[PDB]
Design a protein around this ligand. Structure first.
Ligand SMILES: [Mg+2]
Lengths: 536, 110
RNA sequence: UAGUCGGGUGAUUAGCCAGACUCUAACUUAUUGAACGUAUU
DNA sequence: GGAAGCGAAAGTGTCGCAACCCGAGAGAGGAACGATCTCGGGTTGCGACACTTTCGCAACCCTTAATACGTTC
């Protein structure tokens, strides 16, 4: 109508799409939708930025599990959830993953269904209303500032049923699906990495049926919690084989075989006609696949391989190189780890688990963003539980910075209990989870203290409520006691203070921080007393 | 199954006739109907239900008529929520009831 | 026996009384339209 | 007819298990090596069940109705 036309010309994506669907100026509306999704600019740092960003803004949980009512505001870039009560933290990530299942389902199939809330486990046990709600609001540029979705479930036997409200999510996912069908676009990545990602590696890898090469394999088990590192390895070996081979040589060889078979049928051998028809079909299929590959605007296998290799080596500190070796009629992925060439099964658990996360994520981003110069600059939402899992302090100090550098437009929602990780993150990104004895909280608060660039010891005390020295060790209190003894006299070493000083010296050593502090205390108190005498 | 579904949930869905097996093989019309009337006292002498299905392939599709079942089941459900009432039992025991027993298998589902 | 029909009574959609019927076998429905009854004209 | 959300019905694919095979290795009897038993890695077939697809219940009442009271369709 004229109203839709005005709104569409004003930049409203849904109105433009509705006009496109009714008329199917059809070309103009299609172009407007496609430009809304694809337009973007390269910033001063050389990073591509979409003009219309996609992220989760807000989440509300009503009578869900232990929560009566909980509201969370999320940052566009990075949100970190902290707290001792780690079972509630995981509940929050589960709620988000279920919501994201609705986008994935509808990008894959018209009328796709995402996941539903459980009547048994998701409804709070003492809920008066006997239903549960998970409400989410997404943002997609100024044209679509609010995309609300609600997942709901009522108890059995209630007077009224509580149904989910998913139409806005489906409408948006439909735009992505339909526009992509006509003309390839870049698509959003959704992924969940739970503690399940720590699992051992099956060294034996499965024969390539060729599901892994299909673009929408990027959405396979993406919200399951462990990634699919096995799928990566299969896909990566596949890429290697194609790079070493020529593409269309099989077509040229098949073309030659069909030509040879055609000559035989022309020479009077009618018995081989059935075989010719089969080979012609194979040739047509190969050309079609080639054409579809050509039509799908996908990156060359060589380029795909290179992108992923770079990503892995950049993010995973111990890995400098990754490649496929053809040995013993069996393809093996090898890595240079800490300067030495090893198989994946020879890596440490910390290295393997982190490698698996990054490899999985990069594979999916490459598959879903074929039109970007750097496919890892694509859009998406990634959930990571216990990011510090298996990581040494040195890696904890770099992990968030490395991830954000490799995937600059992903919205990361993470959980941690690491002060070292928190030292690299702004307090605005931090949400603290301090529930009551009933496990129930209303809002999640940012800490008072700035964490980014702060000392770890301060974060421990001010944010995580942990003393810098272990309270259950006597020696941890000696310097405090020593100070008290000095203050109880004028500030002179009495017999008691001297004994303790000697104990500190004996235990911690002559050049210990503890002893230096004691020495400092003596010196300052002596100087205070001298001042006092001069004044008297 | 339509009464049970609607006692459990407002607008619950009961079961359906099979389009593969339940239509009579040599029926000239390619659909089946199962029509039932229930009685619930002199204040509700007739609760008619019809389940219908057209054969697989057929272009015309025959609709079920289940609203009376839903209407009655709504009364049971709503009245019960305000003040507890006794509810009707519906059960089928077919020849599938003869099964091996297993104490070790437990249902962790509800 | 049960179900059904219904003459009466009953501050009356109940209850009670009387009489009767029985193909395997009623389940009381829908307007502003149409038709029928009543009113108005 | 059939919105939007939902689940029944029916077909397909995945995946973990159990059974089995094989070569390696320590080393019984007393000098001649290697008997017997177990480790550890791999292959195969099976079947339970997770995933996928399709159907179908029935909102709304289209710009467009009349209004004395009843009954029927
Ligand atoms: Mg009338």
């Amino acid at each position: 109508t004229k109203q839709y036309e005005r709104k569409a010309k004003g930049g409203n994506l849904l109105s433009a799409f509705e006009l496109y669907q009714r008329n199917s100026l059809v070309g103009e509306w299609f172009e407007m939708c496609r430009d809304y999704i694809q337009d973007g600019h390269v910033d001063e740092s050389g990073i591509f930025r979409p003009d219309n960003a996609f992220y989760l803004r807000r989440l509300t949980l009503k009578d869900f599990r232990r929560f009566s009512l909980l509201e969370i505001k999320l940052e566009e870039d990075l949100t970190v959830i902290i707290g001792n009560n780690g079972k509630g933290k995981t509940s929050i990530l589960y709620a988000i993953a279920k919501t994201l299942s609705w986008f994935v389902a509808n990008i894959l199939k018209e009328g796709g269904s995402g996941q539903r809330l459980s009547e048994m486990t998701d409804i709070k046990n003492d809920a008066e209303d006997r239903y549960s709600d998970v409400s989410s609001t997404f943002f997609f540029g100024k044209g679509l500032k609010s995309v609300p979705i609600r997942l709901s479930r009522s108890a059995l036997g209630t007077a009224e049923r509580r149904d989910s409200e998913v139409k806005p999510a489906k409408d948006l996912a439909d735009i992505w699906r339909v526009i992509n069908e006509v003309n390839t676009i870049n698509l959003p990545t959704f992924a969940l990495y739970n503690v399940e990602r720590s699992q051992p590696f099956n060294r034996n890898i499965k024969d390539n049926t060729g599901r892994r090469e299909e673009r929408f394999d990027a959405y396979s088990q993406t919200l399951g919690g462990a990634g699919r590192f096995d799928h990566f390895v299969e896909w990566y070996i596949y890429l290697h084989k194609r790079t070493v081979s020529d593409i269309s040589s099989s077509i040229k060889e098949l073309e030659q075989q069909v030509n040879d078979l055609q000559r035989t049928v022309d020479g009077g051998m009618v018995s081989v006609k059935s075989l010719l028809e089969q080979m012609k079909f194979k040739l047509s299929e190969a050309i079609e696949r080639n054409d579809a590959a050509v039509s799908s605007r996908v990156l060359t296998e060589s380029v795909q391989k290179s992108i992923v290799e770079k990503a892995i080596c950049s993010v995973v500190p111990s890995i400098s190189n990754i490649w496929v070796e053809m040995i013993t009629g069996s393809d093996l992925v090898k890595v240079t780890n800490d300067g030495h060439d090893v198989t994946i099964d020879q890596l440490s658990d910390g290295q393997r688990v982190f490698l698996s996360l990054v490899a999985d994520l990069a594979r999916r981003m490459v598959m879903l963003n074929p039109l970007l110069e750097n496919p890892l600059e694509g859009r998406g939402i990634v959930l990571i539980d216990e990011i510090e899992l298996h990581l040494h302090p040195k890696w904890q100090q770099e992990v968030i910075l490395n991830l954000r550098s490799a995937f600059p437009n992903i919205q990361f929602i993470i959980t941690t209990h690491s002060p070292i990780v928190l030292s690299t993150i702004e307090k605005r990104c931090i949400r603290e989870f301090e529930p009551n004895d009933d496990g129930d909280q209303s809002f999640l608060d940012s800490p008072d203290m700035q964490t980014k660039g702060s000392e770890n010891a301060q974060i421990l005390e001010q944010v995580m409520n942990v003393h810098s020295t272990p309270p259950g060790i006597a020696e941890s209190h000696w310097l405090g006691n020593f100070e008290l003894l000095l203050l109880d006299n004028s500030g002179e070493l009495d017999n008691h203070s001297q004994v303790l000083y000697d104990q500190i010296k004996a235990h911690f050593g002559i050049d210990s921080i503890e002893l230096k502090k004691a020495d400092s205390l003596i010196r300052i108190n002596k100087m205070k007393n001298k001042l006092n005498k001069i004044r008297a």
